Symmetry: C2
Subunit: 345 residues, 2 copies
């Protein structure tokens, strides 16, 4: 049902960002924005805001005006609403977390919005997921951390920033039966918030450890309806339902949740090695609840995860944009791919 074409996005040159994983991207108009990243493992890279122009196929660095982000971070995320970008969380090797900032793409300046990790306010998070709608920025999951030898934990909550009010609130807690997760899929689809798959903390002491930890790849799917503020678990089906996985590319196009790649087996040494990464794309029809693989012609992106992804439109087609990530060689990549959807959604 979901048909389309994979494309490798040409990058002609300019101030090209070093290869990275664990970073955030978003598009406003004809420009791609890029912030944060990891390379080598556990190491952040820079704090420039990179800008890719889809008309010129070249890179630049956005003017560092206003309240410039204080930390070079990995595990950070970025979304677009209107003409503003929003960056939340991530951390460096020294456990300094990025706070909440907006960037006005028109005036080309940063604004500090929220100090993170204060009592009663949104927490510092890294390897969280983010999405957005007309008047909200949403943050799901990811992992907290005290000090170096602390036992960091995951969130199962959503923090919601009302742009109009300039205020954070936590959405209803889905409760103990809902897995706390980092690097989960998180998207707005036809007016509702969807949480799917990801890397879970166990809520069952009976689940055995792997490499000294119970942590495992989720395959569960939930949706949150702002209209009712209620959570529901969604039973999804299909011969081609994807195996458990995390840190995958994902975007929403109409009724479809579209994913590509991701970690399908844990690395023995956490984020040190690449574990096992998928080279396959799956899409969930949120109406039929059926999963299917998708294919995109002769261009087939190689195994990768920890990519940055977002929804955008290129040459008149909405689809899934994939940038960076780590490869099975354990190297980071600067490659950018776009899956252009051709069929109705």
């Amino acid at each position: 049902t979901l048909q389309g074409e994979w494309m490798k996005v040409e990058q002609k040159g300019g101030q090209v960002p070093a290869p990275r994983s664990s970073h955030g991207i978003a598009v406003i108009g004809d420009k791609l924005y890029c912030f944060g990243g990891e390379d080598p493992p556990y190491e952040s890279i820079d704090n420039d805001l990179y800008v890719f122009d889809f008309n010129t196929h070249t890179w630049s660095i956005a003017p560092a005006n206003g309240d410039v982000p204080k930390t070079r971070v990995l595990g950070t995320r970025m979304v677009a609403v209107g003409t503003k970008l929003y960056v939340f969380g991530g951390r460096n090797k020294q456990l300094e977390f990025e706070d909440f900032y907006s960037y006005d793409t028109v005036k080309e300046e940063w604004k500090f919005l929220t100090k993170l990790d204060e009592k009663g306010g949104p927490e510092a998070r890294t390897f969280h997921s983010m999405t957005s709608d007309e008047n909200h920025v949403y943050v799901f999951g990811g992992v907290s951390k005290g000090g170096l030898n602390a036992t960091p934990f995951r969130f199962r909550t959503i923090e919601a920033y009302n742009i109009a009010e300039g205020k954070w609130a936590q959405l209803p807690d889905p409760g103990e039966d809902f897995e706390k997760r980092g690097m989960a899929g998180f998207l707005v689809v036809q007016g509702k918030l969807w949480v799917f798959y990801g890397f879970a903390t166990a809520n069952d002491p009976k689940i055995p450890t792997l490499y000294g930890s119970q942590d495992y790849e989720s395959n569960r799917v939930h949706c949150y309806d702002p209209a009712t503020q209620k959570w529901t678990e969604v039973e999804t089906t299909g011969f081609e339902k994807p195996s458990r996985r995390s840190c995958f590319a994902h975007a929403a196009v109409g009724k479809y949740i579209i994913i590509f790649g991701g970690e399908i087996e844990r690395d023995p040494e956490a984020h040190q090695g690449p574990g096992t990464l998928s080279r396959e794309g799956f899409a969930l029809d949120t109406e039929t609840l059926v999963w299917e693989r998708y294919e995109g012609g002769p261009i087939k992106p190689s195994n990768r995860g920890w990519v940055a992804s977002t929804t955008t439109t290129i040459n008149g087609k909405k689809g899934l944009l994939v940038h960076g990530g780590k490869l099975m060689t354990n190297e980071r990549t600067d490659e950018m791919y776009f899956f252009a959807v051709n069929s109705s959604t």
Copy 2:
């Protein structure tokens, strides 16, 4: 429940075999025997019989006496019964198929037993699976090439060679609902023949193609009871039930079917690239029908498939022996690993 230790078998030297996949190994006494193999992709290597002595940790080449196999093949297999090795099938790049041979490890000579692909006899096969018991060699599945521009199909049948009588017979055909498969798990376990997972030909036009083919990774498990001549499909369970896969190491130890590695995603170019390979080990308790992962201490074999594997006993421990195969680099390996089961099985 299944507890044990992974070991890298040190290989000191001798006439050590070039790295290879898609080959056969078997053990008699304190010696490992090795025949056939693939490297580079789609290319065979040699027709020497390599011998690894576990007491000396050195390699030698067995005397090439008697009816030496006429073809250097990949996708061949070998099992041991008594002091004889039995080699069946495989092919070269030129679609010449290996016949059925024995090797007497005592007299050090090959004996030609059966011409394959004749009327009323066992068919030529490559990428089939093999196991054995007291008076039989068993062959399951694999793919038969017709001519160069031929299409090929898989078998769902078992050919059984009665050693004392020197005669082949086909076992009851499990029928259309049973997948025709190559690189399937195939073992005798506590008196029954088990067929599980593998790389299947589809029997449903509704299954969509991937990379131009419907072929897919199976996760189904069947068992055949010679005592009743009945096939039964077995429903297996577990949180840690392995995802669909093929070309994995596998062995039987008591009630356990023990597996490691394997192809979990297809390569876009068939056997040209490495696809996606697992670095994980799973075991099935054939009494409880529960799958579980296993771990083996600090030695963790990297992602691989198309390995040769067998059951043997090393240093008083029954277990899974893994040799050769291809890596996610798409290189072949000469590495040998043994998963030593510690508890009773």
